[PDB]
Structures are given as C-alpha cells and as structure tokens.
Design an enzyme around this catalytic site. Sequence first.
Site, mmCIF file in Angstrom:
data_model
loop_
_atom_site.group_PDB
_atom_site.id
_atom_site.type_symbol
_atom_site.label_atom_id
_atom_site.label_comp_id
_atom_site.label_asym_id
_atom_site.label_seq_id
_atom_site.Cartn_x
_atom_site.Cartn_y
_atom_site.Cartn_z
ATOM 1 N N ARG A 9 -5.472 32.581 23.002
ATOM 2 C CA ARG A 9 -5.324 33.344 24.256
ATOM 3 C C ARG A 9 -6.270 34.459 24.526
ATOM 4 N NH1 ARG A 9 1.515 34.174 23.970
ATOM 5 N NH2 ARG A 9 1.919 32.153 23.983
ATOM 6 N N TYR A 43 -14.664 26.308 25.905
ATOM 7 C CA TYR A 43 -13.403 25.527 26.239
ATOM 8 C C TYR A 43 -12.875 25.805 27.893
ATOM 9 C CZ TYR A 43 -8.767 23.802 26.377
ATOM 10 O OH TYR A 43 -7.404 23.060 26.304
ATOM 11 N N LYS A 58 -11.552 27.994 37.033
ATOM 12 C CA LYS A 58 -10.706 29.148 37.666
ATOM 13 C C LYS A 58 -11.588 30.443 37.772
ATOM 14 C CE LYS A 58 -6.816 27.301 36.139
ATOM 15 N NZ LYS A 58 -5.532 26.865 37.148
ATOM 16 N N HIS A 85 -3.458 28.833 43.335
ATOM 17 C CA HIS A 85 -3.224 28.081 42.516
ATOM 18 C C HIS A 85 -2.067 27.033 42.827
ATOM 19 C CE1 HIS A 85 -1.900 27.967 37.764
ATOM 20 N NE2 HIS A 85 -2.622 27.062 38.124
ATOM 21 N N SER A 117 1.483 27.557 34.963
ATOM 22 C CA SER A 117 1.179 26.690 33.746
ATOM 23 C C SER A 117 2.747 26.333 33.063
ATOM 24 C CB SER A 117 0.284 27.549 32.565
ATOM 25 O OG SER A 117 0.625 26.776 31.561
ATOM 26 N N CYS A 165 5.026 24.577 34.398
ATOM 27 C CA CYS A 165 5.964 24.382 35.440
ATOM 28 C C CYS A 165 5.879 23.248 36.463
ATOM 29 C CB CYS A 165 6.119 25.868 36.042
ATOM 30 S SG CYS A 165 6.736 27.107 35.093
ATOM 31 N N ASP A 171 -4.127 21.279 41.425
ATOM 32 C CA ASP A 171 -4.030 22.629 40.860
ATOM 33 C C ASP A 171 -4.821 23.749 41.754
ATOM 34 O OD1 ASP A 171 -4.186 24.117 38.161
ATOM 35 O OD2 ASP A 171 -6.105 24.723 38.534
ATOM 36 N N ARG A 201 -5.579 18.598 26.786
ATOM 37 C CA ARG A 201 -6.034 18.536 28.452
ATOM 38 C C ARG A 201 -6.651 16.918 28.457
ATOM 39 N NH1 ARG A 201 -4.329 22.151 32.695
ATOM 40 N NH2 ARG A 201 -3.646 23.777 31.673
HETATM 41 N N1 LIG Z 1 13.006 19.636 33.590
HETATM 42 C C1 LIG Z 1 11.693 19.424 34.356
HETATM 43 N N2 LIG Z 1 10.545 19.735 33.601
HETATM 44 C C2 LIG Z 1 9.646 19.480 34.362
HETATM 45 C C3 LIG Z 1 9.459 18.917 35.571
HETATM 46 N N3 LIG Z 1 8.454 18.721 36.287
HETATM 47 C C4 LIG Z 1 7.498 18.917 35.243
HETATM 48 N N4 LIG Z 1 8.230 19.501 34.226
HETATM 49 C C5 LIG Z 1 7.602 20.082 33.065
HETATM 50 O O1 LIG Z 1 6.547 20.751 33.163
HETATM 51 C C6 LIG Z 1 5.611 20.687 32.126
HETATM 52 C C7 LIG Z 1 4.378 20.106 32.436
HETATM 53 O O2 LIG Z 1 3.735 21.155 33.231
HETATM 54 P P1 LIG Z 1 2.075 21.479 33.268
HETATM 55 O O3 LIG Z 1 1.266 20.137 33.218
HETATM 56 O O4 LIG Z 1 1.945 22.535 32.310
HETATM 57 O O5 LIG Z 1 2.182 22.236 34.492
HETATM 58 P P2 LIG Z 1 1.014 22.760 35.734
HETATM 59 O O6 LIG Z 1 1.593 23.523 36.940
HETATM 60 O O7 LIG Z 1 0.315 21.610 35.857
HETATM 61 O O8 LIG Z 1 -0.132 23.489 34.826
HETATM 62 P P3 LIG Z 1 -1.631 23.690 34.725
HETATM 63 O O9 LIG Z 1 -2.073 22.434 34.946
HETATM 64 O O10 LIG Z 1 -1.733 24.712 33.890
HETATM 65 O O11 LIG Z 1 -2.075 24.619 35.990
HETATM 66 C C8 LIG Z 1 6.272 19.769 30.982
HETATM 67 O O12 LIG Z 1 7.075 20.422 30.014
HETATM 68 C C9 LIG Z 1 7.216 18.856 31.960
HETATM 69 O O13 LIG Z 1 8.332 18.342 31.239
HETATM 70 C C10 LIG Z 1 10.925 18.597 36.115
HETATM 71 O O14 LIG Z 1 11.080 18.176 37.612
HETATM 72 N N5 LIG Z 1 11.717 18.784 35.558
HETATM 73 MN MN LIG Z 2 -1.675 20.807 35.941
HETATM 74 MN MN LIG Z 3 -3.778 25.698 36.717
#
Ligand SMILES: Nc1nc2c(ncn2[C@@H]2O[C@H](COP(=O)(O)OP(=O)(O)OP(=O)(O)O)[C@@H](O)[C@H]2O)c(=O)[nH]1
Ligand SMILES: [Mn+2]
Ligand SMILES: [Mn+2]
Length: 613
Positions: free
Chosen positions: A85, A233, A242, A262, A284, A286, A309, A403
């Site tokens: 981090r 990285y 970013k 974002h 991230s 979510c 993104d 990634r």
């Molecule tokens: N329970 C649940 N989990 C979800 C859902 N959509 C995504 N996830 C969870 O979200 C996570 C993946 O999110 P990331 O790829 O980190 O999210 P992002 O917003 O694309 O993040 P960045 O690429 O870092 O910007 C995994 O833990 C998934 O299982 C959903 O509809 N329900």
């Molecule tokens: Mn993503």
């Molecule tokens: Mn992102």
Amino acid sequence: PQLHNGLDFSAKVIQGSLDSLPQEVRKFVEGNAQLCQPEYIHICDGSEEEYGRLLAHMQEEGVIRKLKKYDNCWLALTDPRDVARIQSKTVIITQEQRDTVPIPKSGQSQLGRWMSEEDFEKAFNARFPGCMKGRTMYVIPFSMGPLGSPLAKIGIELTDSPYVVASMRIMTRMGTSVLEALGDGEFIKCLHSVGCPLPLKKPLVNNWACNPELTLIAHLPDRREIISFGSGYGGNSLLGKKCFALRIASRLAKEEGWLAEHMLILGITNPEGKKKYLAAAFPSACGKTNLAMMNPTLPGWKVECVGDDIAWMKFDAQGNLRAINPENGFFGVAPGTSVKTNPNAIKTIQKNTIFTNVAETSDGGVYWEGIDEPLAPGVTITSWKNKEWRPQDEEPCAHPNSRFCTPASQCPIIDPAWESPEGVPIEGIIFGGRRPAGVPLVYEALSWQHGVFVGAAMRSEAGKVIMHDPFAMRPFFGYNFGKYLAHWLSMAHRPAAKLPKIFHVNWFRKDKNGKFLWPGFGENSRVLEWMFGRIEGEDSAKLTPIGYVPKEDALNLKGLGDVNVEELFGISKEFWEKEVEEIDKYLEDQVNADLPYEIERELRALKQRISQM
Ligand SMILES: Nc1nc2c(ncn2[C@@H]2O[C@H](COP(=O)(O)OP(=O)(O)OP(=O)(O)O)[C@@H](O)[C@H]2O)c(=O)[nH]1
Ligand SMILES: [Mn+2]
Ligand SMILES: [Mn+2]
Ligand code: NA
C-alpha cells in the site's frame, strides 16, 4: 547548441527521430535524457512488430512468461514489495495546501496528500539524476480517449520499463498516429522510472525492478506533469491509468467545465429496443467491472460495455451529459473473476492479455482465488510467489488485487459507440459500496443536490471497518474535495443541462447469519430495469426518508421467489440516526470550511426526515 557533446541525444536514438518530434516534446524528452542518463532512447511507434518483439525480449530475459494455454497471453510476477500500500507515497504538489485538500477541523485529511514544491524538489533531486543509466528510455505518445475526440487529452510518458510500454499499448492509444495528431498542442508530461540504474546497487527480486524505499508518485497539476519513481506496478507506472485519468484530469475538468470520475459506463437496451447509457462509481472491491460487463438474467435485456473504470463527461450545447471512456483496455482484478461472476471477462482475457501476479497452471493457464472452476487431474499450480501451491494451503495462489490487462476491442459485449469521439449521453449515475447492514438494495436521490450529497456520503466496508469513500474518489481527488462538490453542484446552474437521475445501490447487505440477501451479478439487471423505468418517468417509486425506493411489486423478482424483500429494503430509524451523525462528523472534519452550503442543507434535511420516523 552545446559547447561539448552531452546535450544533443540524437546519437542515442534507436527508434524514431528527435528531429521529427514536436518542439516541446523534444525538449521534454531531451531534458529528461540529460537528467536520467539513459543508454538509449526508443520513440515508440505503437506497431504490432514493436510490441511482439518487446514481449519476446522480456520473455528471453525472464521478466515475463508466455502462457501457452492461451493465444498471445503473458504473465508477470512482481517483487511482492511493489504491490504494498503506497497511498502514503502518492502526492499532489500545489503552491497552497488548501487547493489540494481541505484543511480539516480536527484530524488529518483522508481526502488526499499534499507535498510542498520545496519538499518535492528535494525528493526529485534525490531520485532522478542518473536513474536510467544502462537502460532504454522509451517515449510513449498516447491519447486518453478516441483520437480526435473533443474530450480526449494527450500525454507523453517517458519510462525505463518495457512492461509499462506493453501495458500502455493495451490501456491507451499509443504510437506514431498520436504524435502526428498532437503537433504543437498541449500535452501532459509523464515521467516514470523504476529507480534501479545499472549497475544495480541492490539485489533484483523476481526479475522485477523497483525501489520501494524511494517510491514516490507525484502530480503537479499547475505544471501539467506527473512524476513517478520507484514502482513498476499498475497505477504507479502506467501513468494514464489513475495519475492522468483521475488526478490530473479531475483538475483539468475543474478548470475546463467537465468531470473526470472513477465510473464505469454501460449501455442497457430494454425489450422495446430502447437504449440508455448509465455511469456508476463504486470503490475497489465493489464490482464496477462486473456491472460494466454484466450478462443480464432478464430476457430481452442487453448490456454493453463502454468502459469499466474511468469516465470523462461534459455537458454539450444541447444539455446532454456526454461521456467517453478515456482508456483503450480493461485493467481488471483477476481474483473473484469466474464464469458465474463475469462470463464476458472470461471470454475477453484468453487472448492478447497480460496478467500480473496470478497463479500459473502446469499447462500454461491462469489461476486465482474465486476462479470457481476445477483443474483436470494432473494439472498443478505455481503461485504468484513462484512456489508450488495446493488448494488447501493458507496462502492465496494469487495476489488479492492481481490484474489482467486486456484490449477493450475484445470484449464480446463492447458497445458499438465505445470509441465514438462525441461520447455517449448519460441518463443515470449510480453510487454504491459494501454495506452489510442498514442500506437498501436501491434508492433514488430526490434532486441533483441530494444526489451530490449521496455521492459525498458514500461509505464501504474495508474486525470490519466501514470507511468513507466519497464518489469512489477518495484515493484520486486532484484537488480540494469541497471545491469538487461545488463543481458538481454548479452543473445544475448550467444552460440547458439535462441532469441525470442519481441512484445508490447496495449489492452487499447481509442477514443476521452473514449471508448476502441479494444474489447480485446478472440479477442486478432487475435493479437496472427499475432505474430505466424511473428515468422514463414511470410511477414505480415510493418515498422514504433516504429517497425513493421501488413500490411493492415494482421490482421484477420472477426466478427469485426466495428473496426477502422486506429485510433487503428495510430502513431503520436507529440505523439512519447513527448514519447521519457519522456523515455529519465526517463532513465537518474533513471538508470543514470548504463544505458547500447545499451539502450541509442536504445533511440537515436528511436528519429532519429521519427525525419524523
Ligand atoms: N455479492 C456480490 N458481490 C459482487 C457483485 N458484483 C461484484 N461483486 C464482488 O466485487 C468484487 C470484484 O470487484 P473489483 O473487481 O475489485 O471492483 P472494481 O469496482 O472493478 O475495482 P477496480 O478495478 O479496482 O476499480 C468481488 O469480490 C466480487 O464477488 C454483486 O453483484 N454481488
Ligand atoms: Mn475493475
Ligand atoms: Mn479503479
Ligand atoms: Na518476475
């Protein structure tokens, strides 16, 4: 020109010509060559030949491995120190600290990290002189956005990393066409070094050059410069990703009347052939990339991906909020990606893709936690730390934020307008994060001002910690967050503006046993359907203290008879009293004198509506 022979670097150019560069590009290149002392200068052309040869070179050196199960896919494993981090080491330089972050009332700012000019100059002088000795300086001319888009911006990245060159080719539009488009125009100066001049002063770990102790990622918006040292990285080295995409661009956006966010961008078409574009900001972990690439479960509905993104958005003369994806690829989290959670990503990433910090199967495929598919008997796994690994070991086989880096043109559901220079018209903006309690599946803001407040009040689960992450931009504000809120609010006073509807979602609410109340993923299409009808003016909402929610029977739950709609949409006075208090304290402390009147008013209004429950 020079009284000797150390200023003109023409003799060291191994591809291209200094003479053919635009004047200010030459100055940038040669000035930094003088400073950093690279052995060679390679002006990238963006060709397939350049790319293939550079990959094969990295392969021969052991910097990357070819993944033989797939088509032209590659694996890089980093020094584990280079994915620690580093927000403590990510900074923005301005004359006045208040222009970068609000001055908090009681604590330390969590909304950015300022560094003075004086401290940066000292840090710079202790890092960059001679830092590329024995290495090639690559010159990467790149466009953020479709070439020729009125919303696109151009950068030039100088780097000593071939990994950055290859990844930037995927994630941006790179090469000779960009230099020709640029001419004598303005551009963002992006300077990157891994910080390991030859001969190496410290041991190289896993063939991965980095300098953790001196790692520093700096942004100088009033000089139009990004300067990054010591990390190879991700967002520390791919300076489009970013640094430019959000931190510099958000400041440019403030100056120029647009928004840099974002956010994913998707296009959703209903069973009546009507299509709407939506943007969504989640932090991230979510799920933006899952939503952006959704395979909907509802028959007759289609989702298509513009970006996963970053969104750059500007109101046009007609009042439409036009958005582009300024990226050329997806730099997606691998763990948790499966056929169940993201089938379209699984299709995309089996060709022309670079993977970083995932596991490798004995047959030359990839593996990670949450891949949710078995290996044939015989097939073994090498972890991201280059050790043999078995399913029931305690250590994960992949880094938790490892990634893939894949071309956007390969997504089977890439939107036909994903690189239209005019952008796509946004009709709804969605906020959300991980909230295990209290927050319903979906609600709609009561107004633009309320919607800005909803963005501002976002929180998400990190014993568990719930942290604030306003607009999913906490790591990324290019300037004072209070002034960003005012900038968002100012959009409402703009001539003709068609202000999108704002929603807040929560995919992550849990019951008392810790089980998710909502199945999510492709089932989130049901929530998108409700949003779609709301934008069309449908009478499908009921008023509550937090905003509008779906009426009884408004949400399509066919195929999900087992879902507890009452717990999932429940709104508790006790929970929301606490919530508003928490948001009040946060905004007072962290935004303080820069908190806009309209946001404080929305806070007062929410408190009052909760008080009447
Ligand atoms: N329970 C649940 N989990 C979800 C859902 N959509 C995504 N996830 C969870 O979200 C996570 C993946 O999110 P990331 O790829 O980190 O999210 P992002 O917003 O694309 O993040 P960045 O690429 O870092 O910007 C995994 O833990 C998934 O299982 C959903 O509809 N329900
Ligand atoms: Mn993503
Ligand atoms: Mn992102
Ligand atoms: Na390596």
